[model samples]
Target: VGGPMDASVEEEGVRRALDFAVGEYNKASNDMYHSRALQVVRARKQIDAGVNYFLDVELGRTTCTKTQPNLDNCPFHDQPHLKRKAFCSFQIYAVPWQGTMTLSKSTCQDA
Candidate 1:
């Protein structure tokens, strides 16, 4: 008879939840594509979504720290440890592939 959940397992749930939250934050920041306003909105949404998803997954509370600089705000600031760089340089490589007739008609312009 399973009457109540074990307390030890609850702690694990909390740890996994925090990992998941951080993962989502990383994903959103990585996806901002160097747009400042868009990054702000995306970051907030990422936090909200992470919190809700964690709760729904029956995980627990978590926290996020401002350890990284907002690159969009300061051009000379040093890059963050885990943050991703912009993809502007890939435009050259993508041009040839995107120039093909079949690929030209597709809507994957930004990809």
Candidate 2:
């Protein structure tokens, strides 16, 4: 049986998975402001019917709120005390053959 293998944070799949995770996190978050991945702490992959990505990331709160159309333009909070972070672990499953992606699991805590 196949197990997870350490993966490069720069890998295409990993990058897409992180984007997916961040999007989901922002959508589900009750916080008014949006957040973006500050860093990809770790990444791993498992191959089965499809590719499964496991990612550990640090996310930083941003100045833009959820009302923002895009997170790309959003900047991290300026004030030291306003800047907040969350450490998260996320799982993303992608069936590239079918052009499908899904967030399977996620957990986060304030840092």
Least accurate 10 contiguous residues by lDDT in model 2: 65-74
Q: Clashes per prediction? A: 0, 0
The list of candidate 2 runs beyond 4 A from truth reads 1-48
Give the alpha carbon lDDT tens digit for every residue of 1-111 in model 1. 313433432366544755576666777776654332222112111111111111111221113234655533443224454333332211111223234322222122221
Worst 10 residues of 1 by lDDT: 47-56
Clashing pairs in 2: none
Best by TM-score: 2
Give lDDT for model 2. 0.90
Model 2's number of clashes is 0
Q: Taking the tens digit of each residue's C-alpha lDDT, what string does model 2 give over 21-98?
A: 999999999999999988888899977598999999999899988876788767889798899999999999998867
lDDT (C-alpha, whole model) for all candidates: 0.34, 0.90
